[PDB]
């Protein structure tokens, strides 16, 4: 019945001289959308350093033990039978 929508801008959180980052956004849609993250046009899969989680309409990608190679653009993709929503966020590791 309704295409996905980002209620708030995707955000990337990191502390100065930090070792971990968290990326989150609030997404709604009817039916509830399938949400995934992409970097370098490849899906981000859960593992030891990449943690994916959901809490209602809030979706998270946490990156542990940051490496220089983790820098770049992350795209959040939300999809259901009606449509798809995309929003990107940058991460720069120093």
């Amino acid at each position: 019945s309704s295409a996905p929508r980002f209620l708030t801008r995707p955000k990337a959180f990191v502390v100065s001289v930090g070792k971990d980052a968290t990326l989150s956004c609030q997404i709604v849609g009817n039916p509830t959308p399938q949400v995934s993250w992409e970097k370098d046009q490849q899906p981000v899969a859960a593992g030891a350093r990449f943690r994916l989680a959901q809490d209602g309409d809030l979706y998270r990608l946490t990156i542990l033990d940051l490496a220089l190679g983790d820098s770049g653009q992350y795209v959040c993709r939300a999809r259901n039978a009606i449509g798809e929503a995309f929003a990107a966020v940058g991460l720069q590791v120093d």
Binding site: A3, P4, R5, F6, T8, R9, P10, Q41, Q73, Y74, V75, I82, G83, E84, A85, F86, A87, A88, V89, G90
Partner: protein, 97 residues
């Protein structure tokens, strides 16, 4: 004085025809920059073809294309401007048929 800056815009996005597509993009800038979505030098206006919609808040702009058609495929440019400068980025939108 803070020049505008587009947070991040994908370079390419694909969508099936007959679906709704939404692309959201965050930005910064002081004062709030004016937002322009364009197709080949021409500003796109909200409600064009009864399918295109643009919604802007103070730090987020969203391009909505309802009932995606094959003719909608193309380059869509987001531009921001204030007294301190401008920023611009383009997304290539591909339609799957």
């Amino acid at each position: 004085g803070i020049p505008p800056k587009i947070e991040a815009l994908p370079s390419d996005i694909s969508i099936d025809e007959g679906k709704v597509l939404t692309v959201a993009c965050a930005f910064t800038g002081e004062p709030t920059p004016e937002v322009t979505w364009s197709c080949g030098g021409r500003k796109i206006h909200s409600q064009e073809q009864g399918r295109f919609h643009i919604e802007n808040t103070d730090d987020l702009t969203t391009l909505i294309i309802m009932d995606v058609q094959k003719q909608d495929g193309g380059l869509y440019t987001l531009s921001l401007g204030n007294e301190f400068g401008s920023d611009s980025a383009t997304v290539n939108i591909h339609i799957r048929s």
